[PDB]
Structure formats: structure tokens, C-alpha cells
């Protein structure tokens, strides 16, 4: 019916079909705080919303009114709750409501309520068949939209729609290899399908990541993913990694490479490697280079790491005070 932004929109207090209802003014008290000076349109819609909520009027007109209240303030979770009561109580067609939610999400994609509403609808319908394509359209406009990724994970997990997602991830990593949300989705997909314990998968992922690093050596996401997939087993578990990183030093260096080196050394020292002290001093040198020159924004962290390594891995570390 009458769209909120229609040139011929009329206030509810001017609508004949609402004449029987007394609007309910907001109860702000005798001397209000944080009082919002609402526009006429806003206050008019919400005075009538208060009236139907108070009466618990479950009517077609109340249902239509919730659409306007939502458009005025899509964060009003009370309105969303009442709208869902009305959907069930009036037995509204839920695919029509899906059409509605897809339109509101397109216009207000960063709001929590709209995505929760869509989830409820999908649950009610037990139909995920529009979801991946819908989300992909939202992500085509904002490839890092957090709610969109969250809804995507929920849909994939709950309905077991794993088959095409790695392919989707690869497409987005091509568009922007710096998109951290996409590296996260890569991990989400692999974690839940093959796992990373499969040696051929892990090997494939590491080769892929190293290749991306070579293309874009200052892209922090690829670096965090390489570390993320290797670190639970322990970086020192992978003896070739160190030498291969050192080989990128010359013409692919970054504070990220240097920092990764320190992480490798730290784990080596943790698992009592050969040449304890040689490794320590290499690590301590890098910590100072990072703190003083290459990553000074993190000087306090790098000095803390240096002190930490010294404190527990120096030759004097286990030596009694009397010695």
C-alpha cells in the first residue's frame, strides 16, 4: 500500500481506516533525559504502534504499520517481535515476507534485526534455496559485511551446503586477496569438510598461501592464515618452513616475514631445538630490529617478546642462584 517514502504518504492520524484508534504518546516522564525530538512522521507512526502493541491488535492494518515502524527505525527489536507475532497469527504467506526481507536487507544491510528476521523465516520455511545467491548479492556490494558472512556460515552449516563454497572463496580471493573475511571463510570451509590434518590438504593450503604471499608480500591476511593453519601443531614441527621464509627475505621482505621468523624461533626454543642459544640470539636480534626499526608501532610487544624469550630460554634460565 502506502510506501513510507511515497510522495502521497499520509500520517496515520489522517487515515480514515485508523479513526477508531487513539494513538498512545510516549511515556517519557515529567522531566525527560536523552529526549529525541522526533520528526512528525516518526512520532506519528510510533504513537500508533504503541496503540496496537498495547491492545495486542493482531490485524492486517497493524501488520502494515509494523513495516513503516521498521523502516523508520530498523533497530527497534520490539517492532520486529510484534511483526513476527502477526506473521504467525495472521497466517501471512512467508515467501511474500521473504521478498520483503530481501528488499529491506538490500537497503539496510548492516542492521542486526533484519538478518535475524531472515534467519527465522528460513527456519520456519525450512528452505535455504535462495540463501547463497542472496548473500552473494549483498557481498557483491560489501564483501566484508559481517552479518552476511555470519548468515552464510549458518546456512551452510545448518543445511549442509558445503559443496560449492571453496569455489566461491576462490572467486572472492581473486577479486581481493586482502579480504580477511574471505580467508576466514576459507578456514571455515576446510575445517568443517576435510579438516587440516589431511596432509595433502594442508600441503595444498600452505603452497597456495605462499604463492599469494609472493604476489602480495605486505598482505597481512595471507600471513595470518599461514600462521593460523600451522600453529596448533607448532611451527617448529615444520623444519623446511624456516629456510623457505628466509629465501623470501631478499626480495619479499616485510615486518610480517620478520615477525613470522620470530614465531618459528620461539616455538623451536619451546621444543628444545639444536643450537638453543644460536636460535635465541637470532630471535632477540629480530625482536630488536622490529622494535627499533621495522615495526615500531609494536615496540612494547616486541620488547615484551624479547624479554619473555630471554627469561625462559637463556643459558642461565634453569641455573640456580648459588651457581
Amino acid at each position: 500500500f502506502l510506501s513510507l517514502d511515497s510522495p502521497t504518504y499520509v500520517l496515520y492520524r489522517d487515515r480514515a481506516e485508523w479513526a477508531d484508534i487513539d494513538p498512545v504518546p510516549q511515556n517519557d516522564g515529567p522531566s525527560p533525559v536523552v529526549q529525541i525530538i522526533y520528526s512528525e512522521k516518526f512520532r506519528d507512526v510510533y504513537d500508533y504502534f504503541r496503540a496496537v502493541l498495547q491492545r495486542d491488535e493482531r490485524s492486517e492494518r497493524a501488520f502494515k504499520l509494523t513495516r513503516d515502524a521498521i523502516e523508520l527505525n530498523a533497530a527497534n527489536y520490539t517492532v520486529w517481535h510484534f511483526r513476527r507475532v502477526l506473521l504467525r497469527s495472521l497466517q501471512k504467506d512467508l515467501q511474500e515476507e521473504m521478498n520483503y526481507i530481501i528488499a529491506i536487507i538490500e537497503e539496510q544491510p548492516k542492521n542486526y534485526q533484519v538478518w535475524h528476521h531472515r534467519r527465522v523465516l528460513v527456519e520456519w520455511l525450512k528452505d535455504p534455496s535462495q540463501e547463497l545467491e542472496f548473500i552473494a548479492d549483498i557481498l557483491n556490494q560489501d564483501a566484508k559485511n559481517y552479518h552476511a558472512w555470519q548468515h552464510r556460515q549458518w546456512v551452510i552449516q545448518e543445511f549442509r551446503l558445503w559443496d560449492n563454497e571453496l569455489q566461491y572463496v576462490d572467486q572472492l580471493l581473486k577479486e581481493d586477496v586482502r579480504n580477511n573475511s574471505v580467508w576466514n571463510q576459507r578456514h571455515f570451509v576446510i575445517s568443517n569438510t576435510t579438516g587440516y590434518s589431511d596432509r595433502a590438504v594442508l600441503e595444498r593450503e600452505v603452497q597456495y598461501t605462499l604463492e599469494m604471499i609472493k604476489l602480495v608480500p605486505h598482505n597481512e591476511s595471507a600471513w595470518n592464515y599461514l600462521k593460523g593453519i600451522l600453529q596448533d601443531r607448532g611451527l617448529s614441527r615444520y623444519p623446511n618452513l624456516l629456510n623457505q621464509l628466509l629465501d623470501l627475505q631478499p626480495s619479499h621482505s616485510s615486518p610480517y616475514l620478520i615477525a613470522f621468523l620470530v614465531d618459528i624461533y620461539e616455538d623451536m626454543l619451546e621444543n628444545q631445538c639444536d643450537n638453543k642459544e644460536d636460535i635465541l640470539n637470532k630471535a632477540l636480534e629480530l625482536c630488536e630490529i622490529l622494535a627499533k626499526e621495522k615495526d615500531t608501532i609494536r615496540k612494547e610487544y616486541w620488547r615484551y617478546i624479547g624479554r619473555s624469550l630471554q627469561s625462559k630460554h637463556s643459558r642461565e634460565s634453569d641455573i640456580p642462584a648459588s651457581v
Partner: protein, 407 residues
């Protein structure tokens, strides 16, 4: 020396911190470059205008903006009509940081307004007649604790609050944000915060909750909104802070978390991003930098011998420079980044972040770093609740006088 620049962001070496995009352009790098260029203009304005930089927190301007907002807001705030207790909290907390007293007339009006927001069955809603929700519940409790009078404390219906919390508790240890609502790590924080402040924590209220939060820590080291999701400063703050309240921080890999948050400070801008490869934003001056005091305490509780005894593990100076130079609106109020408009949310969290960056404290040890004029110094804030530590102690003491509902 005379050639020496005391401001970190204005040193000649600082220019080497500009983005290196490896000649590979994507939307991410294009967007980051735009921000850096805008910020460089701010940093350079003194030199181009031939003035000596003076970093001044515009207290009087911020106070006027706040004092007015506490009473009345324009329709720019319609989108926050279901979040009015947040507005109370953001403004009162900003005023508290600026050491501006709360008139008793104001205090009582706030009390009465929040009473109107409180549901008959427990918790607070976004406004009078609205259903309760953990987010405005958290804000309302913080706001009343900032006021900290007998009247304020008495507003909170503790029995119903506890009943409300139980009604949201899920079998897997998580909490709904509200009835019929969504689950994410914010709810664990909101519930833990209000439950600990008001002494209503029962033996089983948070059963399974620490373990649920730990499942939200991901491969990055930070914490996502739900298990599987990308790490984000806001959710990471909620997760860690909630675990601190529950005394379960060790449920997390603290070392990968420490590495992740320190990496979120931007080498050029000085401020923090909310997640990897996104843009700096002044509100993360709290959500991200606020993690460092929490990590310090947790690590210290484990007897970590290598901890500094005078600084947090982030660049305190660079963060102050970002906030003071880039995040202040000349007319009063603070903001996300240059080009953005002021609002009460950023006013709260930019100042909260400034306070954190100014004040180090670990047991007996205390050390302040105040960039710019000494009048810049703010009151301290508690890194768990983000209200003054004095207000935290006073509230907990008062509510500990009462029995946990049900006994």
C-alpha cells in the same frame, strides 16, 4: 635536541609507515590509501601552516555537547530510539571521564527515566514500553552505577533481573540477546557485567558460558561473534572481559590473542582497526586497546615475569596522537575518523580509549603518559566495565550487602 620532533606521527621516519601495496591494487588497498592520505594531511597541517603543533583536548566544547545531549537530541538520533539507555551511558560516562559532576537534579531524572525503561519481568528495554534486551540492560546498569546513589542502585529490580537472565540462558552455555532474539558473545558480556555488578551470580548461572566463549576464539587469535566467525575487536572485548569477570581467562589462548590485538594498531594512523585489513576507527581506541589492560592482568596473574611495569603493550603515544589530532570535532564531540561526523558513541569510546592510553596501573605500580597539554589528563576507566573504577568498587560493595536472590 632542537631538530627532534616530540610527536611520533610527525617524525620524518613516520612516512615510511605508509601503505605498501606491492603494485597490486584491490578495493582493500585503495580504501586504506584514501584514509592514509587524509590522515597525512591532518598530520602535515601544522608544518604546511607554519605553526608548532599543540595537542589540546577541547574539554569545554565536549562538555557543552554532552550537557545538552543528556537532555535533548535532534532527530539525527531517531535510529537510536530503541537504545536510549545507551545514550544515557555514553553521555554520563563521557562526563565522568572529563571529571564533570552530575547535578543531583540530573541524577534523579536519569534514575526515573531508567525506571520507566525497566520491564515488569526483569531487564531494561530501549525506551519506555519497549521489551527488555541485554544491550540496553547493560547500558542502564552502567549508567545507574555511574550515578552511584542509593536512589540509582535501588532502581534495579535484582530478583527480576536474575529471572530475566535465566530466561535467556541456552543449554550450550550461551545467552540470547533478548527473548526470540539472536545469540552472540555480546550477550555473555552483557549478562556477566550486570550480574557481577549487582551480585546476582548464582552457582549455575554461567554454567558452560566460559567454554562457549572459548569456542569463539578463532585461527586469527581474536574472537568472533559466534564460533567460526572472523575475529573482531568488539566481540574480542566482550569475550575477554566476560571471561575476566568469570575468572576464566585461561580458557583462551592468551598468547595468540595478544598477538592479534597488538597487530590491530595501525602503523601509520596510530589508531586501531576492528579487524585485519579494514580501516582505523576511533571507537576501537576502547574495544581494542582496552584488551591490553585485560591481558596484562591475566598474564600477571600467571606470574609472567617479562611484563612491563610502566606501559601497556601498545603504542600509548601514537594512540593519543590519533585521537587528539584526528578524532576531535572543533564544535565538540569526537568521531570515528576525519571526514566523519561527531556522535555520542564515539565521544564515549574515544575518550575511554584516551584514558586507557594515558593511565598504566598494575597493582602498586602507576605510570601516566599524557600527550599534549597536562590538562588533557582524563579520569581513569575500569577496563572490564568501562565505568570509573571508583564506581565499580562502590557498586559492588553496595550490592554485596544484599543476598544473591533466592539465597
Amino acid at each position: 635536541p632542537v631538530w627532534s620532533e616530540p610527536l611520533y606521527s610527525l617524525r620524518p621516519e613516520h612516512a615510511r609507515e605508509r601503505l605498501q601495496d606491492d603494485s597490486v591494487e584491490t578495493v582493500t588497498s585503495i580504501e586504506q590509501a584514501k584514509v592514509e592520505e587524509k590522515i597525512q594531511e591532518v598530520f602535515s597541517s601544522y608544518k604546511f601552516n607554519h605553526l608548532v603543533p599543540r595537542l589540546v583536548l577541547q574539554r569545554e566544547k565536549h562538555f557543552h555537547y554532552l550537557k545538552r545531549g543528556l537532555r535533548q537530541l535532534t532527530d539525527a538520533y531517531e535510529c537510536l530510539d530503541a537504545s536510549r539507555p545507551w545514550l544515557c551511558y555514553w553521555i554520563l560516562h563521557s562526563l565522568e571521564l572529563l571529571d564533570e559532576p552530575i547535578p543531583q537534579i540530573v541524577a534523579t531524572d536519569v534514575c526515573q527515566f531508567l525506571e520507566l525503561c525497566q520491564s515488569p519481568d526483569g531487564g531494561f528495554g530501549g525506551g519506555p514500553g519497549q521489551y527488555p534486551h541485554l544491550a540496553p540492560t547493560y547500558a542502564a546498569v552502567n549508567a545507574l552505577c555511574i550515578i552511584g546513589t542509593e536512589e540509582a542502585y535501588n532502581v534495579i529490580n535484582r530478583e527480576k533481573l536474575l529471572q530475566y537472565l535465566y530466561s535467556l540462558k541456552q543449554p550450550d552455555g550461551s545467552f540470547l540477546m533478548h527473548v526470540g532474539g539472536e545469540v552472540d558473545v555480546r550477550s555473555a558480556y552483557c549478562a556477566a557485567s550486570v550480574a557481577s555488578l549487582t551480585n546476582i551470580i548464582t552457582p549455575d548461572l554461567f554454567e558452560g558460558t566460559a567454554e562457549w566463549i572459548a569456542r569463539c576464539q578463532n585461527w586469527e587469535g581474536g574472537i568472533g561473534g559466534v564460533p567460526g566467525m572472523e575475529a573482531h575487536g568488539g566481540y574480542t572485548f566482550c569475550g575477554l572481559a566476560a571471561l575476566v569477570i568469570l575468572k576464566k581467562e585461561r580458557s583462551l589462548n592468551l598468547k595468540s590473542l595478544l598477538q592479534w590485538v597488538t597487530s590491530r594498531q595501525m602503523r601509520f594512523e596510530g589508531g586501531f582497526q576492528g579487524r585485519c585489513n579494514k580501516l582505523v576507527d576511533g571507537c576501537y581506541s576502547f574495544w581494542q586497546a582496552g584488551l591490553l589492560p585485560l591481558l596484562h592482568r591475566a598474564l600477571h596473574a600467571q606470574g609472567d615475569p617479562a611484563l612491563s611495569m610502566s606501559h601497556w603493550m601498545f603504542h600509548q603515544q601514537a594512540l593519543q596522537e590519533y585521537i587528539l589530532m584526528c578524532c576531535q570535532c572543533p564544535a565538540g564531540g569526537l568521531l570515528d575518523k576525519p571526514g566523519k561526523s561527531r556522535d555520542f558513541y564515539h565521544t564515549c569510546y574515544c575518550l575511554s580509549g584516551l584514558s586507557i592510553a594515558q593511565h598504566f596501573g598494575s597493582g602498586a605500580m602507576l605510570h601516566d603518559v599524557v600527550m599534549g597539554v597536562p590538562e588533557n589528563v582524563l579520569q581513569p576507566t575500569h577496563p572490564v566495565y568501562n565505568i570509573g573504577p571508583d564506581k565499580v568498587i562502590q557498586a559492588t560493595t553496595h550490592f554485596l550487602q544484599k543476598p544473591v536472590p533466592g539465597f
